[PDB]
Structures are given as structure tokens and as C-alpha cells.
Amino acid sequence: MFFTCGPNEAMVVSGFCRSPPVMVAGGRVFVLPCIQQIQRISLNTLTLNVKSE
């Protein structure tokens, strides 16, 4: 089955015959849903209010 992510995210795929996990930023990957797992990370910027007192 095909899985897609925007450029704002990276997809990590681990599983059968994919022991070194495949990492794709903004693309499509063919995955076995019951024998391989997909995880994601947001590439967005965070505007942090860094207080000091």
C-alpha cells in the first residue's frame, strides 16, 4: 500500500527485510501494512519564548 507525506514531515519505515529503517522527507513509499511499520516527525519551526528572570 502507498503512503505519502508533505515536505513538513518525514516518514520512517521499519519491518520485514527493511531492518535499516528507511527515512523519506516529503515523498511516497510502498509498505506492507501488516508486516512493516511507519512512524513520522514534523519538520516545522517552533517559535520559543525563552524567558529569563
Binding site: V12, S14, F16, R18, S19, P20, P21, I35
Partner: protein, 51 residues
């Protein structure tokens, strides 16, 4: 009966017992493993940052 277990890079999976012997630990850190219901148990630990 046996199960196929998929593991993320963030996890250490330890499987005790298996195709290579009796008295041993099988070491996994992402990817996958094959486990026999009564010949090999499966236990995981997170490798993430803790602050």
C-alpha cells in the same frame, strides 16, 4: 505458532531463546524479529532522550 514483530529504531527488543540455542539473549534495535509462542519471549525498552 509464531509471530512476526516489527521494531522502530527508537526501541531495543530483547528476545530470549530461539533458532541459535537455549542459553542466550537475542539483541535487536529497530527492524524486526520472529518469535515462537512458547520457544521465545519478546520484551522492549525505549532508546529515546529523557530530560
Amino acid at each position: 505458532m509464531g509471530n512476526c514483530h516489527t521494531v522502530g529504531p527508537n526501541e531495543a527488543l530483547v528476545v530470549s531463546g530461539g533458532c541459535c540455542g537455549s542459553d542466550y539473549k537475542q539483541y535487536v534495535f529497530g527492524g524486526w524479529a520472529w518469535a515462537w509462542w512458547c520457544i521465545s519471549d519478546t520484551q522492549r525498552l525505549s532508546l529515546e532522550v529523557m530530560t
